[PDB]
């Protein structure tokens, strides 16, 4: 399969540096010009830089010129973006993308999943993970809702999966709300047969990379009245 696995993101002080990384597999990387695209929160797509197949040519958006450097390692099949002198305005999701055809940078058939960059003088905070326990107060006939509250973390994002990716059907992971505390909170919920509560195990797997938080929390029935 064609894959572009991104990394090197996270939280950084204003003025700080990051090195975004994108590991390519499933195609002859050295024959494809590549781009970096950024997307600020609630905004559209902005081209950041272009690099030729061999890496012997690069172009930059005027706003990052001099302070961002694009580079690539064709033996290791890695694309890089070195980012210095970061500003709040740089806070965004970054995508690497490969040209469809390769010889130049034109239009892009494969895009890596976004790398989160937050530029802020605030500290990292890992989330608490609390269970949203199934009771009859969250049973509607044959259906039970249960979940995980992922509370009091910074910055974005957390990723939530259920039973290690086994359970995707019925899952709603809500967008995070910025609490007044300045920290984020979200819930992930799922609806399941209310007859499964007895027999079947429900475990949410919460990952907050900036804080190195990796929780796996059993969510267990709790009969309320």
């Amino acid at each position: 399969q064609v894959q572009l696995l991104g990394s090197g993101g996270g939280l950084v002080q204003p003025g700080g540096s990051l090195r975004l990384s994108c590991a390519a597999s499933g195609f002859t990387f050295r024959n494809y010009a590549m781009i970096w695209v950024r997307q600020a929160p609630g905004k559209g797509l902005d081209w950041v830089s272009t690099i030729s197949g061999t890496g012997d040519s690069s172009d930059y958006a005027d706003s990052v010129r001099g302070r961002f450097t694009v580079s690539r390692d064709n033996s290791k099949n890695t694309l890089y973006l070195e980012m210095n002198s970061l500003r709040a305005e740089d806070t965004a999701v970054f995508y690497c993308a490969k040209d469809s055809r390769g010889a130049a940078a034109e239009f892009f058939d494969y895009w890596g999943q976004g790398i989160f960059v937050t530029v802020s003088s605030a500290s990292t905070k890992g989330p608490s993970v609390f269970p949203l326990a199934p009771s009859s107060k969250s049973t509607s006939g044959g259906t039970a809702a249960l979940g995980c509250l992922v509370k009091d973390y910074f910055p974005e994002p957390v990723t939530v999966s259920w039973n290690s990716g086994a359970l995707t059907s019925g899952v709603h992971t809500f967008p995070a709300v910025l609490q007044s505390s300045g920290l984020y909170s979200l819930s992930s919920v799922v609806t399941v047969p209310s007859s499964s509560l007895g027999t079947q195990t429900y475990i949410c797997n919460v990952n907050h990379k900036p804080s190195n938080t990796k929780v796996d929390k059993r969510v267990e029935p709790k009969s309320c009245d």
């Binding site: 010009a33 590549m34 781009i35 272009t50 690099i51 030729s52 197949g53 061999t54 012997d56 040519s57 172009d59 040209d99 010889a103 130049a104 940078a105 034109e106």
Partner: peptide
Amino acid sequence: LKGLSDEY
């Protein structure tokens, strides 16, 4: 055309 290489 950008992202051109010197050699193909």
